[PDB]
Design a protein around this ligand. Sequence first.
Ligand SMILES: NC(=O)c1ccc[n+]([C@@H]2O[C@H](COP(=O)([O-])OP(=O)(O)OC[C@H]3O[C@@H](n4cnc5c(N)ncnc54)[C@H](O)[C@@H]3O)[C@@H](O)[C@H]2O)c1
Ligand SMILES: NC(=O)c1ccc[n+]([C@@H]2O[C@H](COP(=O)([O-])OP(=O)(O)OC[C@H]3O[C@@H](n4cnc5c(N)ncnc54)[C@H](O)[C@@H]3O)[C@@H](O)[C@H]2O)c1
Ligand SMILES: NC(=O)c1ccc[n+]([C@@H]2O[C@H](COP(=O)([O-])OP(=O)(O)OC[C@H]3O[C@@H](n4cnc5c(N)ncnc54)[C@H](O)[C@@H]3O)[C@@H](O)[C@H]2O)c1
Ligand SMILES: NC(=O)c1ccc[n+]([C@@H]2O[C@H](COP(=O)([O-])OP(=O)(O)OC[C@H]3O[C@@H](n4cnc5c(N)ncnc54)[C@H](O)[C@@H]3O)[C@@H](O)[C@H]2O)c1
Ligand SMILES: O=C(O)CCC(=O)C(=O)O
Ligand SMILES: O=C(O)CCC(=O)C(=O)O
Ligand SMILES: O=C(O)CCC(=O)C(=O)O
Ligand SMILES: O=C(O)CCC(=O)C(=O)O
Lengths: 414, 414, 414, 414
Amino acid sequence: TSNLLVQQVKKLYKVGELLGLDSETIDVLSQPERVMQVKIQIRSSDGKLRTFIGWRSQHNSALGPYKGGVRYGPNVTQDEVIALSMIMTWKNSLLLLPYGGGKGGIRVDPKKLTLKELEDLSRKYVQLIHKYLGSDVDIPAPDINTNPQTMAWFLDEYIKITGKVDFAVFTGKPSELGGIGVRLYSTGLGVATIARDAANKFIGGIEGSRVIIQGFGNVGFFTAKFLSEMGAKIIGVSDIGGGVINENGIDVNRALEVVQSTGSVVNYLEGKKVTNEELLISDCDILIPAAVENVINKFNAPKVRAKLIVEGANGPLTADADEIMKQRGVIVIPDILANAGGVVGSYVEWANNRSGGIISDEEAKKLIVDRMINAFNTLYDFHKRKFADQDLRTVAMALAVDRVVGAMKARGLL
Amino acid sequence: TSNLLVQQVKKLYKVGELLGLDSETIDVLSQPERVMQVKIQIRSSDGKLRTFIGWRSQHNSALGPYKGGVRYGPNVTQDEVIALSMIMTWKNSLLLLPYGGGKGGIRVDPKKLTLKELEDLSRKYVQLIHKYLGSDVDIPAPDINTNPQTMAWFLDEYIKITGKVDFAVFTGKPSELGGIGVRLYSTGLGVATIARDAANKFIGGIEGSRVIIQGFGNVGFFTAKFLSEMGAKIIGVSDIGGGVINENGIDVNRALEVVQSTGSVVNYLEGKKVTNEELLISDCDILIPAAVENVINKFNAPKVRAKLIVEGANGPLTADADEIMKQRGVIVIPDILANAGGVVGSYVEWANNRSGGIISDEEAKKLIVDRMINAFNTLYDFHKRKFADQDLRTVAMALAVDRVVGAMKARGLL
Amino acid sequence: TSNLLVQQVKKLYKVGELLGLDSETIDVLSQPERVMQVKIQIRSSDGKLRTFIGWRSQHNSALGPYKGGVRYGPNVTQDEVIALSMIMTWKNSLLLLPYGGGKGGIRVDPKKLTLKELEDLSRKYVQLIHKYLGSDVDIPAPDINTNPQTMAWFLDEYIKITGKVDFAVFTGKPSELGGIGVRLYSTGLGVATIARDAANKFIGGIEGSRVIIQGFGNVGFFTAKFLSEMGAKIIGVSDIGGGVINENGIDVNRALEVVQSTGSVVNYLEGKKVTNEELLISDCDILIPAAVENVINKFNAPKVRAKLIVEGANGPLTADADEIMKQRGVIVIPDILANAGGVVGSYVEWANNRSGGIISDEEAKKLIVDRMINAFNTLYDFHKRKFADQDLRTVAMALAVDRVVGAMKARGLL
Amino acid sequence: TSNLLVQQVKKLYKVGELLGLDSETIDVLSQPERVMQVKIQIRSSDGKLRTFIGWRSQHNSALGPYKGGVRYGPNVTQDEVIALSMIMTWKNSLLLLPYGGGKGGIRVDPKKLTLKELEDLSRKYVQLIHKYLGSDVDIPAPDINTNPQTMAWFLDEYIKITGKVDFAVFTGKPSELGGIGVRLYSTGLGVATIARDAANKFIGGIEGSRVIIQGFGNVGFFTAKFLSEMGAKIIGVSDIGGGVINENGIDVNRALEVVQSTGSVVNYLEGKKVTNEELLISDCDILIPAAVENVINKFNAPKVRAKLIVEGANGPLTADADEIMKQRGVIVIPDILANAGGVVGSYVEWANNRSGGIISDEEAKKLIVDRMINAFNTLYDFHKRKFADQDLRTVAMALAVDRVVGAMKARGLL
Ligand SMILES: NC(=O)c1ccc[n+]([C@@H]2O[C@H](COP(=O)([O-])OP(=O)(O)OC[C@H]3O[C@@H](n4cnc5c(N)ncnc54)[C@H](O)[C@@H]3O)[C@@H](O)[C@H]2O)c1
Ligand SMILES: NC(=O)c1ccc[n+]([C@@H]2O[C@H](COP(=O)([O-])OP(=O)(O)OC[C@H]3O[C@@H](n4cnc5c(N)ncnc54)[C@H](O)[C@@H]3O)[C@@H](O)[C@H]2O)c1
Ligand SMILES: NC(=O)c1ccc[n+]([C@@H]2O[C@H](COP(=O)([O-])OP(=O)(O)OC[C@H]3O[C@@H](n4cnc5c(N)ncnc54)[C@H](O)[C@@H]3O)[C@@H](O)[C@H]2O)c1
Ligand SMILES: NC(=O)c1ccc[n+]([C@@H]2O[C@H](COP(=O)([O-])OP(=O)(O)OC[C@H]3O[C@@H](n4cnc5c(N)ncnc54)[C@H](O)[C@@H]3O)[C@@H](O)[C@H]2O)c1
Ligand SMILES: O=C(O)CCC(=O)C(=O)O
Ligand SMILES: O=C(O)CCC(=O)C(=O)O
Ligand SMILES: O=C(O)CCC(=O)C(=O)O
Ligand SMILES: O=C(O)CCC(=O)C(=O)O
C-alpha cells in the first residue's frame, strides 16, 4: 500500500547481511508484531456522514512499549504506517530509549475538516485502538498534521474511557496538560544541533553554510530558526505549496508569517519560486528533507548538489538513493539519529510524567541535547573504529538492530 | 490480496441500492470496524525459525460481539479474512443471533507443521489478539484446517493469559471442555436439513436424489452422512486430493476411513477418480460445495449439471455464476442460510456455557434444526411478496443488512 | 501431615497402573497445581491476639474452575486439605461437572470462638486468597463446621473487595443471597437416594433396613431424615460427643432437638450410649460414615457388621479397609458417587446464579436426583463389562481419572 | 523441611523478648502472610515428562510490596523458601527500603536441564503465581542458580500474560531490558565495601588482609574481585566442586577463567585443593561465606580461624555458631547488612524503572554504596548506646523487627 515499506525492508536487509544475521531473523524484524486498522465515521457540519480509515502499527517491543507519532494525510496507507513504525524501532534502539517502535495514521485531508470534525476524528481513533494503548504499552505523539491540540483531545478521550488521569499515555502534550515546553521545538533543535556538529566534523563548519530545508512545519520551521541562530544561511525553504530559493538568505520568521497569512511559504515575495523537485536538486552546502518520505530517489539522487544531507523527515531517501549518495561521496546523517529530538523530548516528557512532574524545562532541554550529541559521538567513534568502510546509516542501523536482536534473544523470541 | 473482498463489497452496494440506503451508509457497512494483523514466529525442532502472518477481522458489532471461525491455509490473505467476516455479519443477522461478524486466518500450510508446531502457532495467535477477544467481545471458532483440538489450544492459552476459565470465549470446543456434542455435526445437519426441505419444495424430494459434495471435512462429511441417512444417494465426494464418483453410491463411513488411513478420499477404491473441476460439472440432482470459495464461476457455471445447489462452503459461487444459475433455472440456496448450522450451533454452545451448562444435547439438536427451517420458511414466504425479481441470496442479504442498519440507527452510529 | 494424602496418592498410582498410564503422567495428577497458605490474626473478645493458619488447595482445573468446600477444625493440616481437593477433582469428573477440584481449611477450633471472631476469621480467609478465587476460577462452599452463614460472610467480603455482586463465587449460600433451598439438604438427599437404590439392587430394599450413621450434621442429619421417610430404621446415630443405639429405631427429629438443647446426640435418653468406635462395629444392615475421614481402617474393617457401606463423608475408609471389605463381601458405595449431592447441588446453584436465577427449587431437586441415579446406573452397567475384577471405587476412579487425563492431553498439558 | 526456618523463628523469639514484645505479637511475625506452592510439568528433550515443585513465600508486607529472589536447587524445600523470605523482611526493614520480604525457589537441579527446559520452567513458575506478583505487589529477583537471563524469561512471560511492559516487576534484569549495570555486581561491591570498613574499624584495615570466600558465583566472584582491587589478599576460594588455597594469593580473574573452562574453581592449578569443610576452618583474617546457608554451625564454629566473618550468603551461621563466635571474640557482620547491596541495587533498579529510567549507572553506584556505609555507621553508633550486651546481628534484628511492628500497629494489624 506504500513504497516506504519496500524501502525500509530493503534497508533492514542490507544491515542484517552486514551483521551476519540469519535470513529468518531478518524476516522476524521485517514484520510488525501487531497492526490495527480501524473505521472512523463522523457526521460533518453539512450533515453528511463520512468514513475514514486509520492504522496503529506496533512494529517491535523487544526494548519496551511501542512509541511513535500519529499522522493525518490524504495519502496515508497501511504500509506507510508500518514502515514508519519500523523507523521508530531503530531510532529508539539507537538512542537507548526503553521504547519499541509504533506509529499511526489516518487517511484523511485534515485541511478540509473543521476543528470540531478533527476533534471527533481524533477521539474516535483513540477509542477504537485503546485496548492496545497505555503508558506502558504504546505511547503515541504528534507527526504530520497533528500537534499538541491533537494530543489534548487524545488524552481527554483516554481519560474519559479509562477513568485514569495518566499523563504519560501521550507525548507532545500542551505544557499545561503535563507536557514540556521544550518538546514543541525539540525535533528541530536536535536537527539543528546535529547539522551543526555534522558540518563541523565533515564540511568545514556551519557558519555561512548554505542550507536548503524541504518542509516548514514543526520540524522544518524550528530547524530553520535554530540553524539561522547558529550562523547558517537558510537559502531555501518549501512546503506542500512549493518552495523559494534566495541566495541572500531567507528571513525565517517572515516566512512563517507568510504561511500564517497565505497558507504557503511559496508566497514569500523575495526569492525564486521553485518546485519541490527543483528545490531538492538546487545548489547548497546542506540539504535537510523535513517534510515527507521518499523525496530523494534513484532519479534525483544523482542531481543532488549538497555535500551533506541531514534527515529531519522520516525515510526521505530510498534504498537506491542511499547507494547513490555512498557512491557519490555525499554524507547522509540518518533520520534515526538526526530527527530523534522528537522522541528524546517525548522520553523526557514521559519520564517526567511518571516521576510526577519534577523535571524543569531547562533541565529537560539539557537532557535532550546531551543525549543527541553523545549518540552522534558514539556513532562517529564506532564508524571510525569498526565500520570505516560503511556509511553512517549503516553503522547506526548496525547498533540499533544489534540491540533489538540481543533483547529478543534474551527474551526467548529468537 | 483477494477478490473475495471485492465481491462482498460489490454485493453490499447492490443490496444497499435495493434497500434505498445512501452511499454514505453503505460505505460504513463495507468497511470493517477493526482488523488486527499479527506476526507469529516458531522454531521447529529441526532448528529453523519460521514466521507466519495472521489476521482477525472484526467487521460489524451492531447486533452483538463479533462471531466467526479461524482458517489455516497457505493462500489466506488479509482481504480473504475481511471478506469472510462480512459473510458472518450477514448470516448472524439473518439467523437473528445476538452476534456481529468476525473471522480470522493464518497464512500457513498446516499440513507441513507438526502437532506441537500447530499448537505453538495457535497459542501465539490467541495471545497476540487477546485484548480484543472475550465471551462478550469476540468469540472465535473453527473453520478450514481448524477443529476442536485447535479450540482446546486456543482456550488453554486464553486461560493461561487471563486466569479465567471462561468456556464461552471459544465455540467448537471439545465436549469435555465446555463444548456440546451437536456442534461437531451441526453445520452438516443444517446443510442436509435445508437440502432435504428445498428438495421437497422444488425437485420432487430427497429420497433417491443423486448428490455430489465437494470437500469431505467437518461440513462435507456430516452433510454426506445425514443426507445418506435421509434417503439420498451420494454419488460423488472429494477433497484437496481429488474426487471419486460412483453412480451406485459412496459408502460414507468407508470413505472417511479412506481419508484416515490414506490422507485423501481420492484413494477410495470403488469409483472413478476425477479432479475437483470434473466433480463439480458431473451429473447429479444436488451439488453441495463444501470446501472453499469461488469454485464455481463464469467458466464452469454453464457446465454444472445440478437442479439444486446448496452452499455448504462460504462464497462458493461467484456473482457471474449466480446470474447463470438464475438464467438456467438452477436453484441456489445461499451460504448465509444453508451453512448457518455451524454458527447457530455455536450460539447454543455459548448460551449453554453462559447459563452454566444446563441445556441438554437433545434440546440443542432441536433448537438448531427449528431455527434453520423457520429461517428458510420465513425467507421463502417473504420472497413471494417482496423482491420477487431477485434471487434468494439477494433477499437474504437484504433482510440481514436491514437488521444491521436498524441496530446501528438505534445506537446513534448512522 | 495427614494420612489422607498418602491414601489418595497411593489410590491414584493404583488406578493409573490399571489405566496403563506412564508413571510420569501419574506424577502430574498426584500433585496440586496451586496451594495457598495464609496467616490470619484476630483480636479476640478477651483482648488476646491469636494467629491461625489456613489453606486453599487448587488441585486440578483441567475440566473447569476449581470447586470444593472449606472446613474449620483444630486438626486441619495442609496435607488434609490437599487430599480432600484431590477427592473433589475425581468426584467432579465422575459426575461430568465443568469443574476441577479445590478445597480449603483453617486450623482452628470454631467451637471456642465467638460469632464475631468466626466472622473475622472467615472474612480474612477470603481476603488473603481472593486473587485466585472467582466464579470462573475457584468457587468455595461449606464443609465441616462451615455452613450458609459462613458463606454469607465469605460473599460479603468478596463483594467488599471486588465491588461485584457475583453470587456464583460461593455455593451453599442462604436462599435470600442467591442460594437454593435444596442445597441445604442435597448431600443427605443424595446419600439417602443412593443408599435406597443400592439397597434395592443388593440387599432386597430399604424398608426396615437397619441404618447406623456416624455424624449428625449437614450430611448426617439429612441422610437420617430422608432414610427415615423412605422407610429405613435408623438404629444408630453419633456425633463428636459419642453415639446412641436403639434397635427399635431413633426418632430423628427428636435427636436433632437433643443436639440443639444439649450439644450432642449422645444425650438422647432412649438408647444405649456408645463410643464412636463401638458405633462403627455395631450390628446393622447399612453403615453410613458421615463425619470425618479414615474412620474405618485396618483395625476396625474386620469387625464392621454391615452388608452395605455408603460413604457420606469424604475418605472414611482407608485403602486397607477397601481390601478387607472386598474380601468380606461388603459392598462399598464410594464417596465420589454417594456424597456428590452436595457438589451437584452446588452446580445447580452456580448455574442458576449465572443464568440470573431462572431455575425453581422443584426443577433443581429433580436435576440433582436424576444426575445421581443416572451416574450410579452408568457406573453399575459399566462395571459389568470393564474393570469387573475391581471394586466400585476403583471403577469410578478409573473413569474420573481417564476424563481428566483426556482433557489435559487436549489442552497440551500432558 | 529446612533447619533454616527453625533458626529464623528461634532467632525471632529471642529478638522479640529483648524488644519486650508479647508472645502473641511474635507469633504473627513468625508466620508468612501468604505462601504459594505450584506444580510445573515439562516435556524434556529426551521426550520424558518431568514434574517440579516450586514456591513463593510472601512473608511480610507491612513496609511495602514483597521483595526477594528466586533460587533453583535440588535441595530446595518449602521451609527453606519461607525462612529466606523472613531474612528478606528484616534486611529490607534494616535498610529502610519500602519493601516487605519475599522469596522463591524451585526444587530442581538446573545443571541437568537444557536452556530451553530452564526457560520453560522459569516461564511456568511466573505464570502459576502471577496473580500475586506485580511491581507494587511482589517483585522477584535472582538468587542461587538464577541470573539476568532467568529474569528476562520471567519478564517476557509476565508481559505475555498481562500485556503490560512493566519493567519494575523483576530486578536483576539485563541492562537492555530495563536493568542497570551496577546490579550485576552490587552484592559483591556491598560485601567488599562492608568488609573493608569493618576491617578498618576492627582489624587495622584491608590491605594485605587474608581473605577466604566460599562460593564464587554472583556474590563470591565480585566480592573477590573488589577485595582484590582494594588491596586484600584472596588466599582461598571455593564452589560446589571444592576449594583452593594459595597463601601467596589467588588470581581472581584467572580463577573465573578456570570455572568457565572446567566448571569448578577446584581445578585452579596453583594452590592446595581442599574440601569446602576444610576451607571454612582454614587460617585467614576474613572469612566470607558466599554460597549457602548453615555452613557454619556448632561443629565447625569452634575451629574457624578468622578474626572477622562477613556474611555474603543468607543465613550461613547457625544460632549456635553466633554464640561460639561471640565467646571467641570473632566479629560477625550479619547478612541483613553485609549482603544488602543486592536488594539496595534492586531498589535503585526498581525506582529507576518507575521513574522512566532517569538515574545513571554512576549515580546508582553512589546511592548503593552510600546507603550501605550509612547503614553500617548508624548500626555501629546505635550499638554503643543500646543493646551493647548483644551482638551486631541481634541489634540489627532489633531495629528491623521494631520498624515492622510499628508499621503493622499503624495499619491496625497488631
Ligand atoms: N513532529 C515530530 O516530532 C517529528 C519527529 C521526528 C520526525 N518527524 C518527521 O518530520 C517530517 C515533518 O513532520 P512535521 O512534524 O514537521 O509535520 P507538520 O505537519 O508540522 O509539517 C509538515 C510540513 O511539510 C510540508 N509538506 C507536506 N507534504 C509535502 C510534500 N509533499 N512536499 C513538500 N512539503 C510537504 C507541509 O506543507 C508542512 O510545511 C515528517 O517525516 C515526520 O515524520 C516529525
Ligand atoms: N466448520 C463450520 O462449522 C463451518 C460453518 C459454516 C461454513 N463453513 C465453511 O465450509 C467450508 C468447509 O469448512 P470445514 O469446516 O468443513 O473445513 P475442514 O478443514 O473440516 O474440511 C475442508 C475440506 O475441504 C477440502 N479442501 C480443501 N481445500 C480444497 C480445495 N482447494 N479444493 C477442494 N477441496 C478442498 C479438504 O481436503 C477437506 O475435505 C469452508 O468454506 C468453511 O468456511 C464451515
Ligand atoms: N456439606 C456438604 O455439602 C458435604 C458434601 C459432601 C461431603 N461432605 C463430607 O461430609 C462429612 C460431614 O460434613 P458436614 O457438612 O455434615 O459437617 P458438619 O460440620 O455439618 O457436621 C459434622 C458432624 O460430624 C460430627 N463429628 C465431627 N468430628 C467427628 C469425629 N471425629 N467423630 C465423630 N463425629 C464427628 C459433628 O459432631 C457433626 O455431627 C465431611 O467428611 C464432609 O467433607 C459434606
Ligand atoms: N545474588 C544476589 O543478589 C544475592 C544478594 C544477597 C544474598 N545472596 C546470597 O548469596 C549466596 C550466593 O548467591 P549467588 O547469587 O552468588 O549464587 P550463584 O548461583 O551465582 O553462585 C553460587 C555459588 O555457590 C557455589 N555453591 C553452591 N552450592 C554450594 C555448596 N553447597 N557449597 C559450596 N559452594 C556452593 C556455586 O558453585 C557457586 O560458586 C546465596 O546465599 C544467596 O541467597 C545473593
Ligand atoms: O515523539 C514521539 O514519540 C514521536 C515522534 C516521531 O514519531 C518520530 O520520531 O517520527
Ligand atoms: O461457529 C462459528 O462461530 C463459526 C461459523 C463460521 O465461521 C461460519 O459459519 O463460517
Ligand atoms: O458443594 C461444594 O462445592 C463442596 C462439596 C464438597 O466439598 C464435597 O463434596 O465434599
Ligand atoms: O535483589 C533482590 O530483590 C533479591 C536479593 C535477595 O534475595 C537477597 O538479598 O538475598
